[PDB]
Design a protein around this ligand. Structure first.
Ligand SMILES: O=C(Oc1c(Br)cc(Br)cc1CNC(=O)c1ccccc1[N+](=O)[O-])c1ccc(Br)cc1
Ligand SMILES: O=C(Oc1c(Br)cc(Br)cc1CNC(=O)c1ccccc1[N+](=O)[O-])c1ccc(Br)cc1
Lengths: 163, 163
């Protein structure tokens, strides 16, 4: 089932299959980001998903890559970071949280990606939920499936992005 | 469950916890092996588990690291490789399979590990079964839990090994 991603014929079908897998699990918004080994910026970044255009533009223009707490987490860990109040420590980090929320992205998680050739990225997914308790229950129900998905997405996406 | 790995202090206790987690999922023999970023040999490796000593020594003395098809796989992929007839092709590769079988390690899988700081290794697990079909059913039944475990073991184990 997960293998349909590597079996996908091209970037278009991969991105579509990834978004549909996420959708079927219950996540209506996803962003897969991957950088080649030892990148100094995002010039060669492979970024694919269905996050709103306005938010993508705003995140870039505001330089939120340097504020977003899930980014530094990804450089230090292979474990998921859940979007919880505790992760936003500084005012800048709270402002990022509010801007994301205003854009419709409030509940979710970020799965770090570390590929066999030094690729560095994240798979982020947001769930449209009523409240945090509801978000938590949903995410726990699907977490083991998502844990497998992120590595399949990484292996397949790396081959598609940089070869 | 998974928190006990972090909670533990000492290589002996950590290894015993991992071994017990693996056993509970149906695997009686495991090996956790981890190398620092860009290692050029095995001198600085952290290798821990309950593989029999005679097999550990033979593998080393025979140079099976350069033959073992799971080793080259780990350098190329984040996805598991099942211990399968098809991964063996050369004469030395058939010899490796035969000797692993003689040591009682016939069915299993190797989960590649790629750490956030360039750590490289594998969690390899063997399952006792009447035949390969049965072994495959045992492994598939716990694959999502194993997928989480290998990442928890990597994050925790890298700290224990190198920090
Ligand atoms: O994908 C990455 O950052 C992205 C980019 Br680029 C654009 C946007 Br918009 C969002 C992210 C990742 N962050 C999130 O998805 C996120 C995390 C927590 C809360 C809210 C959000 N969010 O953007 O809605 C990224 C960058 C560097 C590294 Br290393 C890993 C991942
Ligand atoms: O752990 C690694 O190799 C080991 C070492 Br060292 C000693 C021994 Br004994 C075994 C391995 C890994 N291979 C296996 O466990 C294996 C794989 C397939 C079939 C049978 C076995 N086996 O050893 O029984 C390893 C080395 C390099 C990299 Br990269 C990743 C993993």
């Amino acid at each position: 089932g997960f293998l349909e991603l590597e079996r996908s014929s091209g970037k278009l079908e991969w991105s579509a299959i990834l978004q549909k897998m996420a959708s079927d699990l219950g996540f209506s918004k996803i962003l897969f980001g991957l950088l080649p080994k030892d990148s100094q910026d995002y010039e060669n970044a492979f970024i694919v998903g269905n996050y709103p255009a306005a938010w993508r533009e705003h995140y870039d223009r505001a330089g939120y890559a340097r504020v977003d707490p899930t980014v530094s987490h990804c450089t230090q860990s292979v474990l998921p970071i859940f979007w919880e109040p505790s992760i936003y420590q500084t005012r800048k980090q709270h402002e990022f949280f509010e801007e994301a929320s205003a854009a419709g992205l409030v509940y979710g998680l970020t799965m770090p990606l570390h590929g066999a050739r030094g690729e560095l990225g994240a798979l982020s997914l947001s769930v449209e939920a009523e409240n945090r308790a509801e978000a938590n229950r949903f995410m726990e129900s699907v977490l083991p499936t998502l844990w497998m998905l992120k590595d399949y997405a990484l292996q397949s996406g790396a081959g598609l992005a940089f070869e």
